[PDB]
Amino acid sequence: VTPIPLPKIDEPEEYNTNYILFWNHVGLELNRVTHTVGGPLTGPPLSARALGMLHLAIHDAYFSICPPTDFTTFLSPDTENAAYRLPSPNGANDARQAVAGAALKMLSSLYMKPVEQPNPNPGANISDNAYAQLGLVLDRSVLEAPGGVDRESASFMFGEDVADVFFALLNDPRGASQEGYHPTPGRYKFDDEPTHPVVLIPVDPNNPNGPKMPFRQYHAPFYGKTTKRFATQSEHFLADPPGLRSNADETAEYDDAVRVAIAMGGAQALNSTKRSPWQTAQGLYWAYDGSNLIGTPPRFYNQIVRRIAVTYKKEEDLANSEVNNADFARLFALVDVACTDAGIFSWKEKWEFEFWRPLSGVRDDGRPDHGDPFWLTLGAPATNTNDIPFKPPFPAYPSGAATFGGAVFQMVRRYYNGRVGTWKDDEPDNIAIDMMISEELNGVNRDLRQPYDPTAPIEDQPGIVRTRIVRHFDSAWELMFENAISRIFLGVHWRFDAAAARDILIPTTTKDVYAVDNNGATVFQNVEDIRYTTRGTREDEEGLFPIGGVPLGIEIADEIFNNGLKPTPPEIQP
Ligand code: VO4
């Protein structure tokens, strides 16, 4: 197969001289490649899970050889339960090779062709080319690994054993299974996307030009309720969204949300769209919608975290500093585990409520003075492709990206508190970064005139180039905020999918109705003023629960960090 020419990453080449960062990078490369060829572990929740598994293996492999002081390994060597028992180094003392072994074994197990039975049903959809393309990435990473790879070393072999334990423990082969699920139409109810109601997929993936068959995808409807959690110590729930169950009476919030959805997330040339050019940029910047050569949101969050890590590293030598290695190893384990669990819980709630997307809500509203039967959103950008392909659909509430961001950035905050500065766990931090470029707006990627050619580099393919925008952020609190609201600008999520409207919008004298500027564009509170404290009720449970994905993510990250990254007790696993 012809190797896919991957575009250059906007990041200092010095980063990959550190082996921890190098392996994180390989995981990121596999993420973007798998979404380009349609391989395994695609979609938001599962792509996050792969990174969580990769980093847990690296974490325990490294720390087994170089024991930490203020914490321990995820699994222990003395665990009576064999499934949770970590292997012994027994002489192995080369952390570099141990990490290499863990990373390579995990990634290979995750992306290899499931010949061992799983080929049927599960893998029966992924082409052999998809597997070959992924194999290529793994093959060249071995050649690029700083310090080389020695598969004959006891240390490498030890890393491999660590990976085997984690893979056997946390891999969910049936992850995105939709077998048996069917939408339950009605008001507020999720259903097939009116702009992409069906997909024509080949009967034989290895014969893409042969007969096709209509298919209706539903992205992982059972994953959230049945999959094994990583480090969360309890179940997390959200308040009922406006219009459903206990909050069925919040019609003022719902109606105003529809109003805002139309003005802020409609297609650019619609007379009803009030979103500014700058807000459109903010919307695209955080997208990462499983596009060709781009991948999913977890990949971008990792790109951002890489810069933060290097920017605030304790020692200057990226290559030979054990302090830096331990630092990066611990940080990424925490960040990616939180990302994995955020994906589990956002998906659980998504499919629990089955709340419809703004597109369907506005079109099927039914009230002449509220809806727009012909409304169109700016939508999630279909980057490096000539059309808007069918992307696996899933409910709106809560926003997956909002949740991912909440967990990832709150984790970064908890981890760097006292070091970069000092702040309350629920107040803005000072973790600033600059020269942060999104692959959605990097002056290289584009919207093609013809179908993507996997044999040619992106710059040689005709299309409209995405403007290059270099950003600077004042804090992780800001990153978290913008990442969440960008979804409103895209028109893919309701305001409450991100967080409680009262916590992010400017209120008026009318309850549940928020302010807009001269142009009719919604006004947001200053990032420094934002506090996610507004809560709501649940019909099935007593108490007050958070509203939206950001609060959920923060809640998840705080719990994992407070417990010091400990395995979810098996007694509470599904
Ligand atoms: O990925 V959302 O679920 O944030 O569109």
Curated annotation (Swiss-Prot):
It comes from the Eukaryota. Its EC number is 1.11.1.10. GO terms for molecular function: chloride peroxidase activity; metal ion binding. Vanadate binds at residues 350, 357, 399-401, 487, 493. SUPFAM superfamilies: Acid phosphatase/Vanadium-dependent haloperoxidase (SSF48317). Its cofactor is vanadate. The N-terminus is blocked. Catalyzes the oxidation of chloride in the presence of hydrogen peroxide to hypochlorous acid (ClOH), which in turn can react with a nucleophilic acceptor (RH), to form a chlorinated compound. This is Vanadium chloroperoxidase. It comes from Curvularia inaequalis.
